[PDB]
C-alpha cells in the first residue's frame, strides 16, 4: 500500500534531519589537544597448544585467569592462562561449533553452532566429570553467539534474523527479539545487563532492551556485513567491525556515528573487536593474519600484534585489563601483555 | 620448585594432552565428504544406498566415510561454507529428469558454477552424480532436449546424454589445473555407486600424499 511507500520514507527523512540537527561538532575536533598514546609494543607472553583444527571462539573467565576455547575438532578446552595447564577438555556432540561462553559465576559454559542447538555444560559436579546440563532448541538456523546474563538466563543469536532470551531451568524461550532482515552475526551485553546490541548481515546494528523485549534504536552506516560488536566500558557507546575493512564507533545517547577507523593499506574484513579497560584502545583482529590497536579517541594506529600464521578468529581482553588473548585459525591461542 | 598440588595438576594436564592427541590421531584417518544438491534431486536415494547438519557414517573396505548433508540450512551460504574447507571431496547430485520441469537444470548449473569456483574449494575434487537415468530416457523419448538447451543440435536419443549434459557441467570449472571432476551416471539400483566414490577418494588421497611428499 502507499503507506509503506511514503510514511516510512518521510519518517526516515525526519530521522535524518533530527540526527543532522544534533551534530554540533565531531569527536576528532574535540579531541585535538589530547596527547597521542604513542607506540604500543606487546610481546607474546604465553602460547597455548593442544588444538588440532581451527579455533572459532573464546571467552575469558570473570577472574581473569581461566579461559575457554572452541575449535572445529570437536573439543572445548579450558585453560589456566598463568601456567598454561589444561583444566577440562569437553568432547562436543557436534563438531561444528561457532561460539562459546563462560558463566560469570564460573560454574557453567555454553556452546553452539551449525546444529542450531545451544548446549550448556555444568563444571562443578559431585561426580568429578563434566556433563551436559541442558540442551536448548528452537532456532531454525545456525547459532552464531551466546552470552550469559547469569546462572539461569542466556541470550542467543542465530542465522535466522532473530535473537532469543531463554530460561535454562525450564528450557523455553522466555522472549524473542525480531526485526532484523539478515543473519545476526554477533551481540554484546551492556555492563548493567539491561540492554544489549546485535549486528547483522543486514549491515546494521540494533539496541534491544531485555526486560520489555522490543527494538529501541537502529544504527546504520556500514556498507557490508557486521562480524563483531562490543560495548564501551562506560556503557554509552559501542564499536562495530564489518567486512568492508573499517571499524566504527556508535553512540547510544546521541543516536549517531562518532568516528571511523580505516586505512588505505587495509582491504580485508574484520573478524572481532574489543576495548581496553580504560576505553582508550580498540583492538581489532583482521583477516590478513594481523591484529591492530587503534587509538580510540584519534583513529591513529598505535601498534600491530603480528604473530599469527592464519586468520585471527577470536579476540578478548581480561576483566582487569592485564592481558589480551587472540585465537587464530592455525589452532593457536596467544596471550600478549 | 612446585608444590605437590601443582605437580598433580601438571600430571593431569599431561594426561589430558595424551588423550587429545590420541583422539586427533584416530579422527585424522577418516574420509570426509560434503553432499550438495539442487533439492529433491536424488539425494535421499544416494544416502539410502549408503534441524541442521546431518551426518551419515558408513564403512567400505576398511575405510570410514563421514558424509555431511546441509540441506536444512536456509541461511546465507557464504557465512558457513568456509567451515567445510578440509573436506576431501564434494559429492554433487543432479537429476537428468529435471531438464523439462520448471529450468531446474539451469538452477543446478548456477549452483554448480557457484560452488566449483568458490575461493575455499580451489583444490577439492568434485564427484558428480547424474540421477534418474531411466526417467530421463523415457522423457527424452518424447520431449526434445532443445527445450532446455536451444543451442543444442543433435539426435534425440539417450546416447546424447553424455553429450551436452556432462560436457556442459564439466565446462564450468575455469581452474582445470588444480581440481578434477568425476562424473558417473546412476539409477534407482546399481550397487556400484559406492565403488566410484571409493576410486575417486583413493585418487584424491594418492594426490595428497604425493603433494605432501614433495614429489609433486
Amino acid at each position: 500500500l502507499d503507506q509503506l511507500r511514503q510514511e516510512a520514507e518521510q519518517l526516515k527523512n525526519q530521522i535524518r534531519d533530527a540526527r543532522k540537527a544534533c551534530a554540533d561538532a565531531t569527536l576528532s575536533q574535540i579531541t585535538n589537544n589530547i596527547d597521542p598514546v604513542g607506540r604500543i609494543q606487546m610481546r607474546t607472553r604465553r602460547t597455548l597448544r593442544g588444538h588440532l583444527a581451527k579455533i572459532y571462539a573464546m571467552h575469558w573467565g570473570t577472574d581473569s585467569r581461566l579461559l575457554v576455547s572452541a575449535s572445529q575438532d570437536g573439543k572445548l578446552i579450558i585453560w589456566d592462562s598463568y601456567t598454561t595447564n589444561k583444566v577440562h577438555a569437553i568432547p562436543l556432540r557436534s563438531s561444528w561449533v561457532m561460539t562459546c561462553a563462560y558463566a560469570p559465576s564460573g560454574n557453567y559454559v555454553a556452546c553452539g553452532g551449525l546444529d542450531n542447538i545451544c548446549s550448556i555444560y555444568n563444571l562443578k559436579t559431585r561426580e568429578g566429570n563434566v556433563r551436559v546440563s541442558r540442551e536448548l532448541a528452537g532456532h531454525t538456523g545456525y547459532l552464531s553467539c551466546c552470552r550469559f546474563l547469569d546462572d539461569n538466563q542466556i541470550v542467543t543469536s542465530s542465522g535466522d534474523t532473530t535473537c532469543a532470551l531463554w530460561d535454562i531451568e525450564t528450557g523455553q524461550q522466555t522472549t524473542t527479539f525480531t526485526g532484523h532482515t539478515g543473519d545476526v552475526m554477533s551481540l554484546s551485553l551492556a555492563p548493567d545487563t539491561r540492554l544489549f546490541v546485535s549486528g547483522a548481515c543486514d549491515a546494521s546494528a540494533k539496541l534491544w532492551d531485555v526486560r520489555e523485549g522490543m527494538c529501541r534504536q537502529t544504527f546504520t552506516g556500514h556498507e557490508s556485513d557486521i562480524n563483531a560488536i562490543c560495548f564501551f566500558p562506560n556503557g554509552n557507546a559501542f564499536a562495530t567491525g564489518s567486512d568492508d575493512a573499517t571499524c566504527r564507533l556508535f553512540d547510544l545517547r546521541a543516536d549517531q556515528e562518532l568516528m571511523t577507523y580505516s586505512h588505505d593499506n587495509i582491504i580485508c574484513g574484520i573478524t572481532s573487536v574489543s576495548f581496553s579497560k580504560s576505553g582508550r584502545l580498540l583492538l581489532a583482529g583482521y583477516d590478513d593474519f594481523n591484529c591492530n590497536v587503534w587509538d580510540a579517541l584519534k583513529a591513529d594506529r598505535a601498534g600491530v600484534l603480528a604473530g599469527h600464521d592464519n586468520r585471527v578468529s577470536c579476540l578478548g581482553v581480561t576483566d582487569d585489563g592485564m592481558a589480551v588473548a587472540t585465537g587464530s585459525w592455525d589452532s593457536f591461542l596467544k596471550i600478549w601483555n | 620448585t612446585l608444590s605437590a598440588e601443582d605437580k598433580a595438576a601438571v600430571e593431569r594436564s599431561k594426561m589430558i594432552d595424551r588423550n587429545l592427541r590420541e583422539d586427533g590421531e584416530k579422527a585424522a584417518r577418516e574420509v570426509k565428504l560434503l553432499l550438495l544438491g539442487a533439492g529433491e534431486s536424488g539425494k535421499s536415494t544416494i544416502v539410502k544406498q549408503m534441524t541442521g547438519i546431518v551426518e551419515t557414517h558408513f564403512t567400505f573396505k576398511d575405510l570410514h566415510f563421514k558424509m555431511f548433508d546441509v540441506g536444512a540450512q536456509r541461511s546465507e551460504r557464504k557465512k558457513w561454507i568456509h567451515c567445510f574447507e578440509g573436506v576431501t571431496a564434494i559429492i554433487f547430485c543432479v537429476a537428468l529428469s529435471d531438464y523439462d520441469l520448471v529450468n531446474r537444470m539451469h538452477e543446478s548449473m548456477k549452483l554448480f558454477d557457484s560452488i566449483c569456483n568458490n575461493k575455499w574449494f580451489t583444490d577439492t575434487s568434485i564427484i558428480l552424480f547424474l540421477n534418474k537415468k531411466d526417467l530421463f530416457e523415457e522423457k527424452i523419448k518424447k520431449s526434445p532436449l532443445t527445450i532446455c538447451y536451444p543451442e543444442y543440435a543433435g539426435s534425440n536419443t539417450y546416447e546424447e546424454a553424455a553429450a551436452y549434459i556432462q560436457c556442459q557441467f564439466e565446462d564450468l570449472n575455469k581452474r582445470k589445473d588444480t581440481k578434477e571432476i568425476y562424473t558417473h551416471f546412476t539409477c534407482s539400483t546399481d550397487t556400484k555407486n559406492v565403488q566410484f566414490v571409493f576410486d575417486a577418494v583413493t585418487d584424491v588421497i594418492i594426490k595428497n600424499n604425493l603433494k605432501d611428499c614433495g614429489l609433486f
Partner: single-chain antibody
Framework: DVQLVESGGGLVQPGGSRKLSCSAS????????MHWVRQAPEKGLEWVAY????????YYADTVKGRFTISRDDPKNTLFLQMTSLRSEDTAMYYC??????????????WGQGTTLTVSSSDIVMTQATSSVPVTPGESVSISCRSS???????????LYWFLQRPGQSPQLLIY???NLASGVPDRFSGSGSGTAFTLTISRLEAEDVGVYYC?????????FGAGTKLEL
C-alpha cells in the same frame, strides 16, 4: 550417590600378610587420586599411602616404606593395599580417601567408612596445644593450630586443611587452604591466620558440632596431622 565401601580387616598374627580393598561407586573413579589414611585405636590420624591418577605416582610414609604396596584397578573401580610383615603397632582402622587435583579443586572431599585391623601380640610438625575445650551451645569457639615451617608457598596459596570427625563417624572436610569453605558446610565455620599460625572460628555452636578437629598440611608430601582438639558439652 557417591560412596566408598571397604573390607579386608580382622585378626592377624605378627609377621603375617593381609590385603585391604576399597570399592568406589557413584563417581568417575578414573580421575581421582586415592589416599590410604590410618587411625590408631584412640589417637590422631596418620597418612599411610597415596596413589595418583593413572598410577604414574606413588608415595608411602616413612614408617611403612617397602613393606606396604598400593595399587588401583580402574575397570572394576577398586583400590587395593597389600600389607606384609605386620607388627603390633599396625593395629588401626584404615580409611579410603579421594582427592582430585586441579586449579580451584578440593582435595579430600569424601572419606570411606573404615575397616578395623587388629594384630595380636625434616617432616613438618603440626602442633595443637589445646586438647579439651568445654563449650555450651549458642556461644562461639576458636581452635588454634601451629606448624613448624611456614606454609605459604610462592604461589600465594597456603596449604592447610581443617577436618572434623564426629563420634562414631568418618572425618569430613571442613576447610581447604585455610580460607575456602567445603561444599555443603554451613557458613558459620571460618578460617584465618598467616603462615605458621592458623585459627578456625565457629560463631554459633549447635548440638551437631561436638567432635574432634584436625589440622593437616599439604606442602611436603609426608603429610602430617595435628594431635587434635575435642569439643565437649
Amino acid at each position: 550417590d557417591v560412596q566408598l565401601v571397604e573390607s579386608g580387616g580382622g585378626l592377624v598374627q605378627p609377621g603375617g600378610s593381609r590385603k585391604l580393598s576399597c570399592s568406589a561407586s557413584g563417581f568417575a573413579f578414573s580421575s581421582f587420586g586415592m589416599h590410604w589414611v590410618r587411625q590408631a585405636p584412640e589417637k590422631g590420624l596418620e597418612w599411610v599411602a597415596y596413589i595418583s591418577s593413572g598410577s604414574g605416582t606413588i608415595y608411602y610414609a616413612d614408617t611403612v616404606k617397602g613393606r606396604f604396596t598400593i595399587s588401583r584397578d580402574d575397570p572394576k573401580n577398586t583400590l587395593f593395599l597389600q600389607m606384609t610383615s605386620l607388627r603390633s603397632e599396625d593395629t588401626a582402622m584404615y580409611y579410603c580417601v579421594r582427592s582430585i587435583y586441579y586449579y580451584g579443586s578440593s582435595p579430600f572431599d569424601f572419606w570411606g567408612q573404615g575397616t578395623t585391623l587388629t594384630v595380636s601380640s625434616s617432616d613438618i610438625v603440626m602442633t595443637q596445644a589445646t586438647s579439651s575445650v568445654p563449650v555450651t551451645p549458642g556461644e562461639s569457639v576458636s581452635i588454634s593450630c601451629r606448624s613448624s615451617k611456614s606454609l605459604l608457598h610462592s604461589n600465594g596459596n597456603t596449604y592447610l586443611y581443617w577436618f572434623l570427625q564426629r563420634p562414631g563417624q568418618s572425618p569430613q572436610l571442613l576447610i581447604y587452604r585455610m580460607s575456602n569453605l567445603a561444599s555443603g558446610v554451613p557458613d558459620r565455620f571460618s578460617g584465618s591466620g598467616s603462615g605458621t599460625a592458623f585459627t578456625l572460628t565457629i560463631s554459633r555452636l549447635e548440638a551437631e558440632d561436638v567432635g574432634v578437629y584436625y589440622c593437616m598440611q599439604h606442602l611436603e608430601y609426608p603429610l602430617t596431622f595435628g594431635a587434635g582438639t575435642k569439643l565437649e558439652l
